[PDB]
């Protein structure tokens, strides 16, 4: 599958692509404003994620640090990033279908559109100014808007025992972005696409 990753933001981002135990393609790339990065994602990739990282720096060896989404201090991400991270999530060629979503479960840093570039399913978007409206407790000092599980680390917010429900924090994310997951047990907003679709992830999509 082809994924085009496009930075329309005014700021540089450092894009990242991983399936949790390995990079997808080169794993990461600096994208100045307006730049794009086209990657190949193998068919059958399950549990893949693409995200933006903000305000990073790296040395010539590719080691450094990002204020949002850092992935073990690497330019070329192997592993998932530190919240807050708006997440494009995908599992491909799963019994004939691809499954895509945007999630705010790990917070929000950069507005995002995640759409097919082939036919036959919708895209989804979370492009409201979540950072600017972020409630105080959720603001991340390094920038962005943390999810409540990261901040409070109890099942009320993390949904690890019992049956969590919405909170005033999850409801905030859901109000601003109805089409993205706001907590683990949110009503799903996953889209089923034809197997072997191609996609575009756009940071700061055009309104």
List keywords for this structure.
207 residues; mainly beta; Thaumatin; eight-stranded mixed beta sheet; 4 helices; globular; Thaumatin_CS; signal; Osmotin/thaumatin-like_sf
Structure write-up:
This protein is mainly β. The protein has a single domain (1-207), classed as Sandwich (Thaumatin), CATH 2.60.110. 11% of the residues lie in helices and 37% in strands. It is built from four helices and 13 strands. The chain has helices at 130-133, 148-152, 155-158, 168-176; strands spanning 2-7, 13-18, 23-31, 36-40, 48-58, 64-68, 87-94, 97-103, 112-116, 124-126, 180-181, 191-194, 199-203. Strands 2, 3, 5, 6, 7, 8, 11 and 12 form an eight-stranded mixed beta sheet that branches. A five-stranded mixed beta sheet has the order 4-1-13-9-10, with no helix packed on it. A hairpin with a 2-residue loop joins β7 and β8 (97-103). It is globular and about 40 Å long. The two termini are 26 Å apart. Keywords: Cytoplasmic vesicle, Disulfide bond, Signal, Taste-modifying protein. This is Thaumatin I. It comes from Thaumatococcus daniellii (Katemfe). Taste-modifying protein; intensely sweet-tasting. It is 100000 times sweeter than sucrose on a molar basis. One of its GO terms (cellular component) is cytoplasmic vesicle.
């Amino acid at each position: 599958a082809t994924f085009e990753i496009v930075n329309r933001c005014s700021y540089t981002v450092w894009a990242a692509a991983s399936k949790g135990d390995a990079a997808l393609d080169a794993g990461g790339r600096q994208l100045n404003s307006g730049e794009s990065w086209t990657i190949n994602v193998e068919p059958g990739t399950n549990g893949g994620k693409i995200w933006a990282r903000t305000d990073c720096y790296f040395d010539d060896s590719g080691s450094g640090i990002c204020k949002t989404g850092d992935c073990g201090g690497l330019l070329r991400c192997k592993r998932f990033g530190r919240p807050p991270t708006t997440l494009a999530e995908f599992s491909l060629n799963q019994y004939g279908k691809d499954y895509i979503d945007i999630s705010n479960i790990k917070g929000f840093n950069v507005p995002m559109d995640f759409s097919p570039t082939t036919r036959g399913c919708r895209g989804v978007r979370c492009a409201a100014d979540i950072v600017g409206q972020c409630p105080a407790k959720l603001k991340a000092p390094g920038g962005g808007c943390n999810d409540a599980c990261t901040v409070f680390q109890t099942s009320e917010y993390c949904c690890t025992t019992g049956k969590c429900g919405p909170t005033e924090y999850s409801r905030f994310f859901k109000r601003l972005c109805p089409d993205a997951f706001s907590y683990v047990l949110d009503k799903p907003t996953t889209v089923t696409c034809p197997g072997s679709s191609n996609y575009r992830v756009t940071f700061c999509p055009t309104a």
